[PDB]
Symmetry: C2
Subunit: 357 residues, 2 copies
């Protein structure tokens, strides 16, 4: 069931936005057709984890089926706010990460009839739509203000996180707009500390905290949960998820994943890189520095091999297990006063722990 | 005087954002200092006509000196919201328009130490700072919701206008993501009707309507004015402003302007091009078609010559006159019920009409 009504609302939403364009922005049917394809391609075909989580939270907490309908519909709308938000990021990220492929098909910027400049802007329409749907559907809702603030906070934080990511390979001390600079040769910034920061901000907020929050908001239950504990859950779960993403980038075949990995080529401060650099021999570190941040497939393979040789699958297992127990305890801390919420967090973790995506 | 306080508030705003980044986002000094440079370079050095308008509306409309202080400070914050919004759009426009230079210096994405990926994200940071500064300064402010909503609406409209601009040279009939397509060779879409659509949406709203409205809101005076007339003015003054932009792109020396024109090279649907094409001989038109949308300087120079030869300067003078008096009529309608507001609108017409910039 969750999915049936979700897609039901996708169509309401989509209809509202396109019709609004035609009626109020003087839009010709070609561009309207174009933007429909852009919407479907950029927003559909994922697993909808963030949007579904919102609904799930709404459901779990509603422990006069008219309220039920209102809460569930709102939850769906928030659900798509996040998915459209996600979509926006992904459109821009792929350009920034110079990716080729996404969800089994070419990156939006790589579609044959999509110029790079139009993709950038298509990415922005996407973000605007999150506001547009919110304003329409929640016009007369006493929570729209708070909703919108929180949502802008997360978005900002995500943007900030992306700065961390996109500059993780330059020596921060030499980071000056006026002066050109090459990629770091010493990698002194590839530390777990910096890794954790990138990920907390680029991924944990919008992927884990935000959907929990929006589910609570549409259900008028925000004050009923330990937020400090809710926030730790999200920070932990989101870090692990990003770490999973980093591993898959490297070691999962693109056909399962939907996308070809660029973290090595782009010289990303991935979990692998940082965990590798902290335990590795000088000899290994040296071979790494010699092969990292390069298009060349042999170099890419070498980096992959160093990772295998340094037994990073060792470290991952241990990290994972360590995440799982902290998560288990915090869920129980939350179950004391918040049982319904706590169950949906458990489901969310269910979808994370050992995901094969 | 207005300018004295506007820059005090800039510091205030800047000091708040950067400190937040430090205290709440775990930001290191290097990135902090990068972000300060980015902020200054993208938000300063222009003329601030959008920002200053807001204050002037505020000041006009005032008709215990503490409300005055509150309303004025609020107006500066609003003024910077639009200037930061403008800042965002320009970072992204310059990339999309492939421009070289802006406000006397290289485009942000062209700064030696700014990568393209990072500029795109810096533009997004700029946008989010409009929300954040609002959230902060207006937290206890009954109008914050109305403001954010109106602001988002306009922002979205600008994005829609930008799509009109960026696709204006493709046969819209063939516009499909899945299939590549070269520049239109027939230019059927280079009509004044389509031109008017581009410009209404990409420039008029944020540049003219939005400063006026913001001034009204913080003055708590929105309902005192004929909004349908206000909008008429803004659309008019906005179209004419963009017509002026298009012309200078072509015939103003880069040094007076602070930027190099790209409209010819980008094959943009500028006012000149529509105006030329509707009146030129078939021969002239063939020539234009041979030379438009190419970086080659001789081809670029030919086009310039075609525009001069077609006496577009007669068409401009006429348009200006018609606009000028159509505006004058509408101001007087407005002066009737709201003479304080109407004055600030005339001040604003005063900074547009015959601008050299
Ligand atoms: Mg990335
Ligand atoms: Mg990526
Ligand atoms: Mg990845
Ligand atoms: Mg443009
Ligand atoms: Mg431009
Ligand atoms: Mg221009």
């Amino acid at each position: 069931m969750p999915m049936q009504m979700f897609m039901q609302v996708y169509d309401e939403i989509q209809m509202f936005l396109l019709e609004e364009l035609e009626l109020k922005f003087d839009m010709d049917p070609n561009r309207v057709r174009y933007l429909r394809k852009m919407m479907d391609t950029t927003c559909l075909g994922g697993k909808y984890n963030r949007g579904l989580t919102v609904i799930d939270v709404a459901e779990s907490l509603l422990s006069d089926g008219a309220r039920r309908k209102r809460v569930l519909h709102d939850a769906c709308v928030c659900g798509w706010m996040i998915e459209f938000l996600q979509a926006h990021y992904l459109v821009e990220d792929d350009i920034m990460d110079n990716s080729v492929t996404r969800r089994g098909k070419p990156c939006w910027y790589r579609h044959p009839d999509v110029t790079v400049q139009c993709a950038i802007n298509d990415g922005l329409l996407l973000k605007s739509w999150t506001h547009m749907m919110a304003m329409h559907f929640f016009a007369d809702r006493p929570f729209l203000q708070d909703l919108l603030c929180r949502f802008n906070r997360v978005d900002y934080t995500t943007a900030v996180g992306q700065l961390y990511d996109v500059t993780s390979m330059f020596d921060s001390n030499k980071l000056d707009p006026d002066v050109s600079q090459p990629t770091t040769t010493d990698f002194a910034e590839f530390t777990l500390s910096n890794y954790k920061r990138i990920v907390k901000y680029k991924t944990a907020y919008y992927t884990y905290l935000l959907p929990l929050v929006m589910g609570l908001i549409v259900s008028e239950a925000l004050p009923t949960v330990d937020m400090g504990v809710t926030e730790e859950l999200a920070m932990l779960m989101g870090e692990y998820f990003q770490v999973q993403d980093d591993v898959m980038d490297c070691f999962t075949p693109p056909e399962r994943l939907g996308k070809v990995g660029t973290d090595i080529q782009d010289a990303k401060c991935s979990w692998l890189a940082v965990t590798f650099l902290a335990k590795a021999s000088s000899a290994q570190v040296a071979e790494f520095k010699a092969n990292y941040g390069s298009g060349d497939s042999e170099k890419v393979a070498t980096v992959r091999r160093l990772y295998e040789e340094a037994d990073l699958q060792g470290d991952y297992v241990a990290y994972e297990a360590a995440v799982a127990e902290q998560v288990k305890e915090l869920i129980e801390k939350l179950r004391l006063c918040s049982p319904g919420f706590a169950a949906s967090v458990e489901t969310l973790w269910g979808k994370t722990y050992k995901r094969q995506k």
